Amino acid sequence: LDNGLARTPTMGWLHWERFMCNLDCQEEPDSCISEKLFMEMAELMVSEGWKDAGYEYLCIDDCWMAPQRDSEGRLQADPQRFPHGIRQLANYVHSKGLKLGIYADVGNKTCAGFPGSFGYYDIDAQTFADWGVDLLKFDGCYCDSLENLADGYKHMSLALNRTGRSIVYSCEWPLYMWPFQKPNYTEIRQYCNHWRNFADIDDSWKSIKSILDWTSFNQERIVDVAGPGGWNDPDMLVIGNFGLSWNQQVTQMALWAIMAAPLFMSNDLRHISPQAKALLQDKDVIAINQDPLGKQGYQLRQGDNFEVWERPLSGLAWAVAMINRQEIGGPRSYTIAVASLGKGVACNPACFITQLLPVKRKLGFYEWTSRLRSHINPTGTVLLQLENTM
Amino acid sequence: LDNGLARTPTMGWLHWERFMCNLDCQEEPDSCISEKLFMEMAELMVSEGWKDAGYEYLCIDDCWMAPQRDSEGRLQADPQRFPHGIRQLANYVHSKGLKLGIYADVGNKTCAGFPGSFGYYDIDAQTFADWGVDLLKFDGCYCDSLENLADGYKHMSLALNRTGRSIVYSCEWPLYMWPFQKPNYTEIRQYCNHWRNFADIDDSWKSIKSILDWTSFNQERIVDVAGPGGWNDPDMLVIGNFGLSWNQQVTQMALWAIMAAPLFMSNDLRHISPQAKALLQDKDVIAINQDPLGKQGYQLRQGDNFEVWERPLSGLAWAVAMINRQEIGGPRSYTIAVASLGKGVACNPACFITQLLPVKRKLGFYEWTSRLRSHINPTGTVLLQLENTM
Ligand SMILES: *[C@@H]1O[C@H](CO)[C@@H](O[C@@H]2O[C@H](CO)[C@@H](O[C@@H]3O[C@H](CO[C@H]4O[C@H](CO)[C@@H](O)[C@H](O)[C@@H]4O)[C@@H](O)[C@H](O[C@H]4O[C@H](CO)[C@@H](O)[C@H](O)[C@@H]4O)[C@@H]3O[C@@H]3OC[C@@H](O)[C@H](O)[C@H]3O)[C@H](O)[C@H]2NC(C)=O)[C@H](O[C@@H]2O[C@@H](C)[C@@H](O)[C@@H](O)[C@@H]2O)[C@H]1NC(C)=O
Ligand SMILES: *[C@@H]1O[C@H](CO)[C@@H](O[C@@H]2O[C@H](CO)[C@@H](O[C@@H]3O[C@H](CO)[C@@H](O)[C@H](O[C@H]4O[C@H](CO)[C@@H](O)[C@H](O)[C@@H]4O)[C@@H]3O[C@@H]3OC[C@@H](O)[C@H](O)[C@H]3O)[C@H](O)[C@H]2NC(C)=O)[C@H](O)[C@H]1NC(C)=O
Ligand SMILES: *[C@@H]1O[C@H](CO)[C@@H](O[C@@H]2O[C@H](CO)[C@@H](O[C@@H]3O[C@H](CO)[C@@H](O)[C@H](O)[C@@H]3O)[C@H](O)[C@H]2NC(C)=O)[C@H](O[C@@H]2O[C@@H](C)[C@@H](O)[C@@H](O)[C@@H]2O)[C@H]1NC(C)=O
Ligand SMILES: *[C@@H]1O[C@H](CO)[C@@H](O[C@@H]2O[C@H](CO)[C@@H](O)[C@H](O)[C@H]2NC(C)=O)[C@H](O[C@@H]2O[C@@H](C)[C@@H](O)[C@@H](O)[C@@H]2O)[C@H]1NC(C)=O
Ligand SMILES: *[C@@H]1O[C@H](CO)[C@@H](O)[C@H](O)[C@H]1NC(C)=O
Ligand SMILES: OC[C@H]1O[C@@H](O)[C@H](O)[C@@H](O)[C@H]1O
Ligand SMILES: OC[C@H]1O[C@@H](O)[C@H](O)[C@@H](O)[C@H]1O
Numbered sequence: 133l134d135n136g137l138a139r140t141p142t143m144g145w146l147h148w149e150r151f152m153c154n155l156d157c158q159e160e161p162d163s164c165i166s167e168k169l170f171m172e173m174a175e176l177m178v179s180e181g182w183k184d185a186g187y188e189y190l191c192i193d194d195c196w197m198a199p200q201r202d203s204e205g206r207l208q209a210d211p212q213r214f215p216h217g218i219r220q221l222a223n224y225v226h227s228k229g230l231k232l233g234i235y236a237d238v239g240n241k242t243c244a245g246f247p248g249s250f251g252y253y254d255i256d257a258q259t260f261a262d263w264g265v266d267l268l269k270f271d272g273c274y275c276d277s278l279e280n281l282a283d284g285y286k287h288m289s290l291a292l293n294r295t296g297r298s299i300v301y302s303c304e305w306p307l308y309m310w311p312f313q314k315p316n317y318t319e320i321r322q323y324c325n326h327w328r329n330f331a332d333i334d335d336s337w338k339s340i341k342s343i344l345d346w347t348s349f350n351q352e353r354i355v356d357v358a359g360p361g362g363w364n365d366p367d368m369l370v371i372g373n374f375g376l377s378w379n380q381q382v383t384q385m386a387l388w389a390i391m392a393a394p395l396f397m398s399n400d401l402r403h404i405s406p407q408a409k410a411l412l413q414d415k416d417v418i419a420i421n422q423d424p425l426g427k428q429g430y431q432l433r434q435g436d437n438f439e440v441w442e443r444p445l446s447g448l449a450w451a452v453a454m455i456n457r458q459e460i461g462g463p464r465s466y467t468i469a470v471a472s473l474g475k476g477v478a479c480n481p482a483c484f485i486t487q488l489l490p491v492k493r494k495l496g497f498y499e500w501t502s503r504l505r506s507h508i509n510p511t512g513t514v515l516l517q518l519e520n521t522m
Numbered sequence: 523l524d525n526g527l528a529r530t531p532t533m534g535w536l537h538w539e540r541f542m543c544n545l546d547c548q549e550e551p552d553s554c555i556s557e558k559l560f561m562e563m564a565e566l567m568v569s570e571g572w573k574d575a576g577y578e579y580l581c582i583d584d585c586w587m588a589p590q591r592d593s594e595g596r597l598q599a600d601p602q603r604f605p606h607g608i609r610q611l612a613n614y615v616h617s618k619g620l621k622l623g624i625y626a627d628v629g630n631k632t633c634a635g636f637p638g639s640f641g642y643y644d645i646d647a648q649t650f651a652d653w654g655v656d657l658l659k660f661d662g663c664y665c666d667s668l669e670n671l672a673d674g675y676k677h678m679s680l681a682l683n684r685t686g687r688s689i690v691y692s693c694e695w696p697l698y699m700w701p702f703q704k705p706n707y708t709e710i711r712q713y714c715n716h717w718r719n720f721a722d723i724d725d726s727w728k729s730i731k732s733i734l735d736w737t738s739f740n741q742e743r744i745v746d747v748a749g750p751g752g753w754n755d756p757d758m759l760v761i762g763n764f765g766l767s768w769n770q771q772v773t774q775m776a777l778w779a780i781m782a783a784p785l786f787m788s789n790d791l792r793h794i795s796p797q798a799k800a801l802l803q804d805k806d807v808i809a810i811n812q813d814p815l816g817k818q819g820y821q822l823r824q825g826d827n828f829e830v831w832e833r834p835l836s837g838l839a840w841a842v843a844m845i846n847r848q849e850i851g852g853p854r855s856y857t858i859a860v861a862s863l864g865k866g867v868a869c870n871p872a873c874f875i876t877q878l879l880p881v882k883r884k885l886g887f888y889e890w891t892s893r894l895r896s897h898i899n900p901t902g903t904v905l906l907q908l909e910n911t912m
């Protein structure tokens with residue numbers, strides 16, 4: 133979408149995976165979806181270095197709405213959970229130097245069952261602009277027909293544009309086409325800043341694997357469409373929660389960098405391990421994700437339960453990730469000819485190789501004819517950066 | 523098996539899951555299956571508190587053998603990897619106050635392809651006894667017929683007995699039988715100290731879940747057979763490796779306690795996190811696994827992606843584990859009437875409840891009509907002990 137936004141993948145925090153649709157403020161006041169949750173997160177995004185690392189969008193997912201529209205046909209924030217309204221939350225967020233994201237749905241209802249924007253696109257776009265919203269995530273539930281789906285996504289894109297406010301537009305259009313029609317990404321890119329392709333992530337290695345496998349399976353369709361202003365969205369980072377081993381977390385961070393993915397954390401910033409924080413704030417890995425050239429990476433090789441992915445970067449550099457998918461035994465040795473990397477130009481006549489994950493260390497110069505040997509933990513990933521010089 | 527052994531579930535270390543069949547001592551000298559690996563582990567079992575916590579069996583799995591039997595028809599240790607032979611390793615292990623386990627197979631070959639004991643049962647039992655072996659794990663690969671399978675397992679049991687040496691006999695009889703025929707556990711219990719029921723574990727949550735699910739599914743058939751001298755074997759603890767989150771590790775430790783499982787660690791004792799060490803050496807949890815009454819636990823309840831398991835302990839105490847199988851969101855609240863626990867007798871008229879995992883804390887006294895409220899991390903478990911008094 134040519135609105136000057138998302139020139140690099142959008143970075144931020146999104147409540148959904150960790151907090152979901154928790155409406156019970158009596159029993160669980162500190163984790164229900166409320167204005168206090170978001171205000172506390174916004175404070176921590178500043179004080180704990182997240183904004184400095186690049187995480188600038190604080191995003192509200194489903195279950196912020198009251199069950200009914202107001203008398204003027206507007207969506208309204210839940211009166212008990214957001215008693216001061218969204219405008220005041222947006223102002224609070226803006227006062228911290230952050231941007232506010234919000235959620236809505238193209239059909240008759242949101243996926244959690246609250247009011248949808250079908251029949252109200254202009255009104256909802258105008259409401260969001262008036263409130264000071266900076267990002268809209270626009271979901272595809274309860275939309276009966278595919279032509280209503282596409283028209284809805286287009287209409288909302290145009291309506292947001294007509295407000296004159298700069299709003300990042302995050303779509304789920306291709307995901308909801310999945311069963312019925314081949315998405316046209318040229319068309320989607322024209323109307324959206326990013327688009328969800330695959331089923332919702334959860335806090336599990338099974339989920340990370342299916343997203344990676346669906347992406348490499350479909351890379352020939354989707355990798356080239358991506359670029360400044362328009363990204364594939366493989367869903368939230370779930371690092372710092374409960375279901376991933378340390379090595380599986382490293383794998384997610386490295387591969388979301390390779391994929392030029394938007395980086396939306398979904399975790400509890402109040403209770404996050406120092407290890408998870410350092411990984412999510414890793415400046416060299418973030419610099420790969422945020423590379424100005426914005427060329428999405430891809431799977432180069434798979435065999436013997438190993439996978440090699442690579443991403444072309446600016447300045448003739450390359451990022452390379454090697455994943456060990458064998459979920460038994462110990463660290464396994466993997467060797468690759470550096471002449472196979474970067475279409476044969478990454479290390480001709482030579483390249484300097486730096487390991488970024490799981491720990492940072494300089495590996496030295498590698499001649500075009502040389503071999504790279506690595507040891508990769510099960511379910512883990514080694515991430516490398518290849519450069520002309522150190 | 524009435525040989526006076528395994529009156530509580532056997533505790534020890536087993537190489538297989540972490541080190542597998544690594545024969546390459548040139549490239550990977552520190553992780554190939556060799557006498558040095560076992561000698562180092564034995565040292566650490568003593569110096570790092572493992573023996574004190576109760577782990578006394580140091581066990582060699584498959585791939586210790588030379589490709590051929592010697593001219594006297596005996597199995598031999600690989601000459602390059604075990605140059606000093608099994609007897610000297612057994613003596614070294616015994617000198618540390620530990621016991622040595624070894625592996626063989628009832629059929630023509632071991633699962634990794636080395637010599638099987640079919641046709642050599644007496645010779646092999648005698649070899650193991652003469653070496654000073656204290657435990658035999660006896661696998662079921664390369665055995666065509668089920669009557670040869672059963673006869674073989676029985677024969678070896680009787681042959682071990684005839685040596686006069688006290689040897690723990692760990693079988694895989696029901697596992698190799700199940701695909702074709704319902705095993706007879708009365709018969710298996712007569713001949714074996716423990717028996718593997720289900721497919722090999724690996725370093726994954728998927729694997730832990732399938733073992734738990736197969737066990738609760740089949741609990742009517744297997745729970746009552748277990749007791750002093752004869753245990754169900756749900757396979758190795760894989761805590762301290764690569765594929766499990768912290769909460770999934772707690773789940774394994776708690777449930778293996780509830781299930782009266784032999785506790786065979788398969789990890790690298792040279793490189794284990796302090797967290798994993800504390801969990802595996804947790805004395806109150808180990809005391810549950812090793813409870814003298816030796817009544818296996820069982821799944822009491824399942825619903826809403828929760829599971830409640832319980833185990834009767836000596837002194838009218840009970841152990842209760844509550845597992846959250848919802849792999850999205852945050853810690854979920856779970857409430858249960860203490861009157862549902864221990865068939866209604868656990869907290870009549872009252873009981874003192876202590877949480878053991880994920881952290882130890884006393885919860886005070888609970889009357890028969892009370893309700894217990896807990897918060898359970900996703901893929902995590904809360905483990906409680908119910909007693910008459912503190
Ligand atoms: C090879 O196979 C043989 C079996 O086919 C093994 O022999 C068995 O070994 C058992 C364990 O030693 C033994 O069981 C014990 O028997 C003791 C006496 O019991 C008789 O007398 C009782 C009155 O005193 C009477 O009530 C019983 O009915 C018996 O007739 C007894 O002291 C033992 O109890 C003590 O130890 C057990 C631990 O095992 C504790 O649970 C118990 O609280 C107490 O402290 C035990 O009694 C009971 O045996 C039956 C069993 O169901 C109960 O669980 C158990 O409590 C058993 O009698 C014989 N069986 C036969 C047929 O002889 C043999 O073991 C070796 O030999 C024995 C004698 C002993 O020296 C062991 O240490 C040896 O390993 C096997 N040999 C090898 C090398 O594997
Ligand atoms: C509603 O829709 C219309 C589109 O129909 C939007 O208008 C478009 O707005 C963008 C604003 O950035 C504008 O892009 C710029 O165009 C001028 C040339 O006319 C350039 O100076 C800009 O380049 C500079 O900035 C960009 C950062 O975005 C950077 O990439 C460059 O290196 C340089 O610093 C920029 O040119 C674009 O550069 C990126 C390339 O992919 C684009 O093709 C190229 O145009 C569009 O030209 C403008 N289009 C039209 C037809 O007016 C409008 O912004 C939107 N409104 C809201 C509120 O969303
Ligand atoms: C997927 O959707 C995209 C975007 O709409 C399609 O590309 C577009 O195809 C149109 C043809 O239907 C092009 O319109 C033409 O414009 C010229 C003016 O220069 C006219 O002379 C001509 O009559 C058409 O009106 C349009 O240029 C093009 N847009 C972009 C941004 O490329 C795409 O069509 C397919 O790909 C393009 C590149 C062409 O090769 C088409 O022939 C081809 O069908 C859509 N994909 C599919 C599979 O239909
Ligand atoms: C499973 O194995 C058990 C132990 O070998 C069998 O029980 C034994 O059966 C013998 C005759 O086959 C009999 O002399 C023994 O008394 C008896 N031993 C014990 C400890 O119970 C069992 O056989 C079944 O149950 C017995 C009681 C009889 O009813 C038999 O006719 C049954 O076949 C075996 N069960 C099965 C299902 O094969
Ligand atoms: C969806 O909403 C529209 C307009 O708001 C309304 O006319 C229509 O009846 C609704 N559709 C269904 C299936 O309820
Ligand atoms: O198909 C996935 C990728 O394959 C590469 O060979 C190509 O250079 C990329 O542009 C992309 O097409
Ligand atoms: O559901 C299986 C379990 O059921 C319990 O009620 C019984 O006490 C256990 O021994 C076990 O059989």
Ligand SMILES: OC[C@H]1O[C@H](O)[C@H](O)[C@@H](O)[C@H]1O
Pocket residue numbers: 148193194242243244271304332
């Ligand atoms: O209900 C909210 C939920 O709805 C859909 O499933 C979306 O794909 C999710 O990302 C989340 O926004």
Ligand SMILES: OC[C@H]1O[C@H](O)[C@H](O)[C@@H](O)[C@H]1O
Pocket residue numbers: 538583584632633634661694722
């Ligand atoms: O090759 C050794 C291997 O053989 C079988 O698969 C067993 O079930 C495993 O526990 C292990 O002993």
